[PDB]
Design an enzyme around this catalytic site. Structure first.
Site, short mmCIF file in Angstrom:
data_model
loop_
_atom_site.label_atom_id
_atom_site.label_comp_id
_atom_site.label_asym_id
_atom_site.label_seq_id
_atom_site.Cartn_x
_atom_site.Cartn_y
_atom_site.Cartn_z
CB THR A 22 42.92 81.12 -58.59
OG1 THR A 22 42.54 79.70 -59.22
CG2 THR A 22 42.38 82.23 -59.37
CE1 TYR A 59 46.22 74.80 -58.69
CE2 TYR A 59 44.96 76.58 -59.26
CZ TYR A 59 45.88 75.74 -59.32
OH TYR A 59 46.57 75.96 -60.72
N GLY A 209 54.09 79.90 -64.53
CA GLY A 209 55.43 79.99 -64.05
C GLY A 209 56.17 80.94 -64.62
CG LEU A 211 56.81 86.34 -62.37
CD1 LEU A 211 56.26 86.79 -61.55
CD2 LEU A 211 58.05 87.30 -63.17
CE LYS A 219 59.29 91.17 -53.72
NZ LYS A 219 59.41 89.82 -53.62
NE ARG A 285 49.69 85.93 -49.31
CZ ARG A 285 49.63 87.06 -48.15
NH1 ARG A 285 48.47 87.33 -47.60
NH2 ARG A 285 50.82 87.81 -48.25
CD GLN A 289 51.05 89.04 -53.65
OE1 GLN A 289 50.13 88.37 -53.80
NE2 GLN A 289 51.78 88.89 -52.59
#
Length: 327
Positions: A22, A59, A209, A211, A219, A285, A289
């Site tokens: 999040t 956060y 993490g 990715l 991408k 977000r 996604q």
């Protein structure tokens, strides 16, 4: 059957092996209409069968937790919330905020009360030390946490970014259910110590993490560049001449993924899951996604796919040779 779920000691129901991260949900400390997307994102996660949400006080300095608490109150659910503590913020806003490590017992007790209130729960399912405090013995912190567990304020306890020695110290005082380390195809350092530790001591790994900061989404390309503000501007992996090596590896990973009819993004996350007793954190977000989460479940890498992965890494991004001599 148990390839999509895993049990966390101290929590009754099995957790999905993808968890919602999040950091992009209420990641800004000031809210607004944009909070609605965050809520809708959590709701979308829940509908994909994710029942673990990982969040943190830091956060948005409470804001992410508030959104999670809000989202979970609006939609019937059986979600479990993992949160964190041990980071202290001082200041008004994003501009002047100072963030430091603070695992003093008084700060720990206060943070648990705050997380209970923001999440709107009476018990934290999983409470994790976000970072080891260099100025407070681990013992003091684990002692406070173990007590609050007994008061019934916390179900399971975890740590993040601890060394094996630090985890040993924690475990003398309190049961360790989870460890949250960084892990991805291009960043496998924790394989040497953290994973074996988790296996030997029966802790579940919450890998973040997966990715590698976008590199593994499939991408990016040779033309991808980042703003002065963006952390990636000063990251060697995203710079000449390394970036092309990583992109090159990515093209092979992509062909490998294609053979299964999987996207490279889903393949990268599934790789992370198949390294151990691992739950991969998945960031989002907006609700779109989260659609790819579906692709991660229902299969696992073959030993041949795992070998191919190593072959691909060795062929394009070989580990640097140490300056010191070695027989």
């Amino acid at each position: 059957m148990a390839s999509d779920t895993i049990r966390i000691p101290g929590i009754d129901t099995p957790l999905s092996r993808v968890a919602l991260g999040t950091w992009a949900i209420g990641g800004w400390m000031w809210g607004g209409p944009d909070d609605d997307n965050g809520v809708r994102t959590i709701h979308a996660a829940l509908d994909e069968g994710i029942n673990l949400i990982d969040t943190a006080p830091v956060y948005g300095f409470g804001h992410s937790e508030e959104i999670v608490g809000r989202a979970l109150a609006e939609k019937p659910n059986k979600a479990h919330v993992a949160t964190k503590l041990g980071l202290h913020w001082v200041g008004e806003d994003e501009k002047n905020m100072k963030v430091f490590r603070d695992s003093r017992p008084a700060r720990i007790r206060k943070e648990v009360e705050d997380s209970l209130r923001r999440l709107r729960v009476e018990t934290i399912d999983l409470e994790q030390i976000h970072w080891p405090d260099d100025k407070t013995p681990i013992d003091e912190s684990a002692r406070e946490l173990q007590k609050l567990h007994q008061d019934g304020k916390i179900r399971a306890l975890g740590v993040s970014n601890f060394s094996p020695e630090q985890m040993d110290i924690f475990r003398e005082v309190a049961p360790l259910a989870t460890i949250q380390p960084p892990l991805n195809l291009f960043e496998r350092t924790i394989e040497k110590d953290i994973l074996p530790y988790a296996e030997k001591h029966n802790a579940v790994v919450l890998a973040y993490g997966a990715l590698c900061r976008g590199l593994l989404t499939g991408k990016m390309n040779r033309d991808t560049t980042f703003p002065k503000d963006d952390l990636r501007s000063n990251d060697p992996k995203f710079q000449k001449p390394n970036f092309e090596k990583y992109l090159a590896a990515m093209d092979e990973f992509e062909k490998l993924a294609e053979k299964r009819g999987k996207s490279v993004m889903a393949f990268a996350v599934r790789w992370v899951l198949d390294q151990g007793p691992v739950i991969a954190l998945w960031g989002a977000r907006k609700p779109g996604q989260v659609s790819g989460v579906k692709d991660v479940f229902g299969w696992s890498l073959t030993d041949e796919e795992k070998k191919a992965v190593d072959d691909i890494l060795a062929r394009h991004v070989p580990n640097p040779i140490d300056p010191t001599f070695m027989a």
